[PDB]
Amino acid sequence: PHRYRPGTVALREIRRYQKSTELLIRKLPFQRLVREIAQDFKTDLRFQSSAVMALQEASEAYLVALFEDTNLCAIHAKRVTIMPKDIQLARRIRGER
Amino acid sequence: HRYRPGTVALREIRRYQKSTELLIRKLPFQRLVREIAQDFKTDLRFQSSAVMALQEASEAYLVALFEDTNLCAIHAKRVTIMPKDIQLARRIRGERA
Amino acid sequence: KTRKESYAIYVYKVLKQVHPDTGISSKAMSIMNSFVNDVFERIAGEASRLAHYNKRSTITSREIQTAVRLLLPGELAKHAVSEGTKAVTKYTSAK
Amino acid sequence: TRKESYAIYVYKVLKQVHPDTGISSKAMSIMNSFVNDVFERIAGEASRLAHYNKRSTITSREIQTAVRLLLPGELAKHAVSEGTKAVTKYTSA
Amino acid sequence: TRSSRAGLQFPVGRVHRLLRKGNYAERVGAGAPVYLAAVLEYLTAEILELAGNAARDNKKTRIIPRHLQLAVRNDEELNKLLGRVTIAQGGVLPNIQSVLLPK
Amino acid sequence: AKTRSSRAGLQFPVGRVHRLLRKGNYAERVGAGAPVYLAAVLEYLTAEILELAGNAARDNKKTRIIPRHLQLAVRNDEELNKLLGRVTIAQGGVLPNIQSVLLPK
Amino acid sequence: KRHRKVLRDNIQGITKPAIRRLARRGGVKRISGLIYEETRGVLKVFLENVIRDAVTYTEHAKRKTVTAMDVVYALKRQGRTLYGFGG
Amino acid sequence: KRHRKVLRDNIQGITKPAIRRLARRGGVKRISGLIYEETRGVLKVFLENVIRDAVTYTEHAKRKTVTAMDVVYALKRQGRTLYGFGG
DNA sequence: ATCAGAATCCCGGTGCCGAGGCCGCTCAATTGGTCGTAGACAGCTCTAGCACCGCTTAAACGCACGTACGCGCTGTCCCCCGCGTTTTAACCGCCAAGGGGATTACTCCCTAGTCTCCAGGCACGTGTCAGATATATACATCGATAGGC
DNA sequence: GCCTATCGATGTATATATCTGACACGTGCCTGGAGACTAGGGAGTAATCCCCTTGGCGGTTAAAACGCGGGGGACAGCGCGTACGTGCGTTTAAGCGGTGCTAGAGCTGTCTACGACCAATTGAGCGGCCTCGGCACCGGGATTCTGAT
């Protein structure tokens, strides 16, 4: 049986996604999630096709720049695993609450 | 008598957070403010309020750095902040890239 | 000489309505003078972009109401609409 | 209907610099957003400077003291040079 | 005077002059600065209501710049509005984290 | 000539910028020297970015400029990274970046 | 199998390998397991702060359609300016 | 003792117990020793970014005196708005 | 839980100077009439949005194995804290200007303003090659047990 | 007990080959930039004004500086053991296209009410003056911790 060492598929995975430039989250579950958040504020809201897309790019790059800034805290604890105390640190330093 | 290490600093933190005045010495600060004016335009004058306002935006930036730094050096299972902690806490805020 | 304008009497009138037995230092009086001009530049600075996005050229009472609900957080915006709309409604009925 | 853009003016600069290089529409719509985004950064800053100094006008000097505020060290020192080359050739014309 | 015809304290005309001379629009409607003075008035009446409570919390009758720092930072909805503003002669809030206290 | 962009020796418009200063409610009296200055500073910034994009666009061997090239140029240059500090570019990816701790030895 | 379907909560639409693909772009080699309950709480509290601004621009303009620049002019309020989507 | 004085670098004017008093306000119990060489480098790189804006406001207004609002209008450029100093 | 010890905490007496009124006074708010533009409103095309199905095909789902992390433990070194005491520069107070901020009044050029005009710059069609996609093809790296040190 | 080894095993890179899509390019055309002119006021300039910033000295006084001793913490190494990654087969809904209508955006066209504009008038709101009491203030006695037993 062939099986890589655990911790080597992720290294080839990182060097694939930093070369690609497409959207990782799919367009349909993100479309249905946006509609349920607006329903608490206003009923009967249509959406343009670009406003689902243009919400998505500013939702992904907020996560990747968060996942860039919760990675360094895990290296700061001499770790690799980004345990969820790192994110609630990494939003505190950027002032987001 | 000889106090233990720790209850003297914890009387300072109960004293300085109650107080509200300037903790950096005035004349060494205004010799600092004047000496970085020469790198941009020589022969400048300063009002006595303008190196008072420049202290309260210098004091309230180090305090809001050390409060962010102490939450980092807590997180790495330590109690002592370090120069490696500051360069992390400046990296996440977007000031130092 | 130089006659500067301020918000000195207007804050001290308001403080006496909600606290009669209360003074205020001049050092704090310079804060609320600088607090209001920070807020009023932030609201009207947002009201300029609202009328410009819809290609209009008039700040009416509506754009402030859609600038107050933008800047202010969740709880404070529900009050300043209610305080704001009552003020115009007493102003429109009066002469 | 009629929509004002910058797509021709980014293109002529592109043939001025990289004379064999095309540009996609998605890349062209970034610069058309980017050119407009430097505008309200500069003109929003130059408007704040003339109101602060009790003036009521925006000359070519207020742009020069708004460019040095925004752009960094190596970028602003060339923009003021290329700006002053443009105004002097206009006032000579 | 429009400050009393709407039943307010802040000057309507001084705000209304600051919306025309300030170049925030070409035209300024008459409904705008009467609405604007009340928004400023409630927000000023919000700050001093929590500032003056800090005066009785420390048994003083005048408001120093410490008590404004105590009101804005303790409040949760006023702190999101002024999250980046620093206040001169304010200090910080008294907080000690849990691992720093002696066992 | 007649056009002001030739009379300033530029390519960006001037009359369009001069209208887009006046109707934007910035100040009462826009001076006639400022759109000559403003169109130059807009040109040099576009001449900075489009030159840096096609450098990296040549390295992936493509004639056209794609938004991946525009993200790759303005994040590489430190003097452009300080200007576009909090701007998200659509279709950007990231800079290739792995830290030295996660690598095997 | 069918008597009633699951109809899950629409926040689990941002699926577990989808979040994992985001951390791989963000330069993370090894991810925890409790983070998948956390980062849905981050994105729900983030899209709340944008769409609240996106409605109030559209509610003022007397429309029913949150267009492209009712998001871009909402993002510029938060300081995270987007490019590429026109204007 | 006198033949020539030390005339130290004016960045050591922000003295070692002064920095220590700042960390005590910031809720730090125990401080390192190598931090005193670090935090002078932070304050020197911070006052450079404010005074560069403070000069350019004054250089435009044809003055020689960096007043109070050539600092407050320089700090508002950086987003760290100051109060209390008038206007 | 006890003991004595330094270090806040309060109570009170003092007093000083900043806030609180007071008054005069002027720029500016108000009242008023005039006025033309923006904007409200109504009516009108029609492009793009929403809802379902139909269908292929991929990613998501789940399960087991295990292994490399996370994790807590001990021990050890030292780099810090804390006090004690010289030492020095800061704070305060003052002398001593004089540059420059900020005031005035005046002059004029430059901008806004309307007018007339005329192509630069638009939308839209239209070929066409530049990348999309691929399969092949070679060449890498990757563990794995193999060999010999 | 270790470095090398050498495998095929999966994985990317590179190869040409073929082709679809948007990319430029041409056209007609219309809105908006340019030429032209003239009136006004903002900005320039000069001049005079008096604050207020810079200077250093004297003295003082508490912070800063220097050193030491010790102990708490950073530090690394160890052994645990679970919660991870990995891979497989299985199931599922995202993708895609495709129907279906119609709201709703965007458009023109009216039309009138609103706010700019201007002049006339006076008092709210400024600076300056003035006085009194809130809080700094210390000293003592009272307390609450602290370390040591």
Numbering used by the authors:
A (entry chain A): 38 to 134
B (entry chain E): 39 to 135
C (entry chain D): 28 to 122
D (entry chain H): 29 to 121
E (entry chain C): 16 to 118
F (entry chain G): 14 to 118
G (entry chain B), H (entry chain F): 16 to 102
Task: Quote what the paper states about this structure.
CHD4, CHD3, and CHD5 form CHD subfamily II, which differs in domain architecture from subfamily I. CHD3, CHD4, and CHD5 contain two N-terminal plant homeodomain (PHD) zinc finger domains, a DNA-interacting double chromodomain, and the ATPase motor. CHD4 is a subunit of the multi-subunit Nucleosome Remodeling Deacetylase (NuRD) complex. CHD4 is implicated in the repression of lineage-specific genes during differentiation and is required for the establishment and maintenance of more compacted chromatin structures. Here, we provide the 3.1 Å resolution cryo-EM structure of human CHD4 engaged with a nucleosome and the 4.0 Å resolution structure of a nucleosome-CHD42 complex that contains two molecules of CHD4.
